Amino acid sequence: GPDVSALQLLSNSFESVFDSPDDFYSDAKLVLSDGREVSFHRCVLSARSSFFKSALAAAKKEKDSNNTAAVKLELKEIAKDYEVGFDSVVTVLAYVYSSRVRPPPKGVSECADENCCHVACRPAVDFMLEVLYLAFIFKIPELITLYQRHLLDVVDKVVIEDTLVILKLANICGKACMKLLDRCKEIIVKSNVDMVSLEKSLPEELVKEIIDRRKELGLEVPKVKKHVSNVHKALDSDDIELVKLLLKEDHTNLDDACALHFAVAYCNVKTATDLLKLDLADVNHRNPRGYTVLHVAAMRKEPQLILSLLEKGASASEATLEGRTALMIAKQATMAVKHSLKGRLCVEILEQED
């Protein structure tokens, strides 16, 4: 194959261009969220995508460099509608340069557990989400096809509370992720995620689109019981004595509104702290989905809450329907490794009290 070998040679040459970019007359820089800069050459990213073409063309004249300065592209000020890391950026640029995908570095898409195969857990998933969003915004259709195929293949195993973020990002995209959007939507619909849970962490248009679908399979679950909406809307807006007086006013089973789980998962740490300082609601009374208070406390990655609820005597050895305790929730939430030390501190507490 004389034809293919020359193509291989071109690909290797440009891969060597990317690997050592300082030496080969690199011009521009992409500046990330935290502040890392990745060097690149205007020619190749101008040619390989329309988006960078428009961006560089626009940014040319508005400034003069006199060969003593580059042009900087702020990924925080361009890809506005989501947040991305560093290794995904490296992967996308490496695909642009060398026409092949680069496997992620060690200890990134692997979480903490002993025998978590690292296929569906949180780090692998959100790595895929970051690279898919970057490819969508940068207009590379084939990379869209590949990574959308990956997510669509894995989507069955993942837990619902991450299928939600998958759905959110899929809606962030356009028609490019139509298959993923529809599959994920029909996954969520047949489940039993409560009204408030969808309303809090999904756009209004989409929650309408799903709540008028709930009653279409013949599955009659309307939105009722506006009584607890007062407590929820009164405690999400950071007021405590108000809800104390309200609960003491009508005497309408505070715990039965799952105020503990709601405040632990969606409210702020101070609010949950004072709510647990008050002692008028049970702690092991699990919510309709099947999560106790400390399950979601661990999933939120807040060590102060975990230790405080350990002080309340809540049984930290009771598993959900799937069978996962606080230890394994905390393990599969985190990323194995100037980083986020929250996750690695909660795992320790649940291996201690024995």
Give binding residues for Zn(2+) as ranges.
111, 116, 118, 121
Single out the residue of 30, 38, 79, 111 in contact with Zn ion (rule: CB under 5 A): 111
Nearest in space to 180 (alpha carbons), one of 150, 203, 215: 150
Per CB under 5 A, the list member of 90, 116, 176, 198 interacting with Zn ion is: 116
At 159, list the tokens.
Answer: 């837990």
Q: Which of residues 130-169 bind a copy of itself (CB under 8 A)?
A: 142
Which segment (17-25, 265-273, 279-287, 305-313) binds a copy of itself by CB under 8 A?
17-25
**Percentages of the chain per state (helix, strand, coil), in multiples of 5:** 55, 5, 40
CA pair distance 269, 259, nearest whole angstrom: 14
Distance (Å, whole) CA 285 – CA 281: 9
The verdict on 43 binding a copy of itself (CB under 8 A) reads yes
* Closest distance of CB 20 from a copy of itself, Å: 10
6 binds a copy of itself (CB under 8 A): yes
How crowded is residue 339: how many other Cβ atoms within 10 Å of its Cβ? 8
Query: Which span sits near a copy of itself by CB under 8 A: 22-30, 197-205, 217-225, 312-320?
Result: 22-30
Longest dimension (CA), the chain: 85
Coil, strand, or helix at residue 37? strand
> In which region does residue 331 sit, left (phi positive, over 0), alpha (psi from -120 to 50) or beta (all else)?
alpha
Contact region for a copy of itself (CB under 8 A) — 31-39, 44-52, 236-244, 346-354? 44-52
29, 32, 39, 56: residue in contact with a copy of itself (rule CB under 8 A)? 56
**Residue 327 makes contact with Zn ion by CB under 5 A:** no
Q: Does 121 bind Zn ion (CB under 5 A)?
A: yes
Residue 54 in the binding site for a copy of itself (CB under 8 A): no
Cα gap 229→235, rounded to integer Å: 10
Q: Quick one: 127 or 133, whose CB is closer to Zn ion?
A: 127
CB 215, min distance to Zn ion, A: 37
**Does 10 contact a copy of itself by CB under 8 A?**
yes
**Which of 101, 159 has the CB closer to a copy of itself?**
101
Query: CB under 8 A: which stretch of 46-54, 104-112, 267-275, 288-296 binds a copy of itself?
Result: 46-54
For the residues of 46-108, what is the DSSP string, one character each? HHS-HHHHHHHHHHHHT---TTS---EEETTTTSTTS---SHHHHHHHHHHHHSS--PPPTTS
Q: Judged by CB under 8 A, which of 63, 80, 100, 226 binds a copy of itself?
A: 100
Task: Identify what 118 binds: a copy of itself, Zn ion, none; CB under 5 to 8 Å per kind.
Answer: Zn ion
Give 40's strand partners. 28
The Cα angle at residue 17 between residues 14 and 21, in degrees rounded to 5: 155
Q: Which does 253 bind (CB under 5 to 8 A by kind): a copy of itself, Zn ion, none?
A: none
SS3 193: coil
- Rounded to a whole number of angstroms, the minimum distance from the CB of residue 44 to a copy of itself is 8
In the complex, the residues that contact Zn ion under the rule CB under 5 A are 111, 116, 118, 121
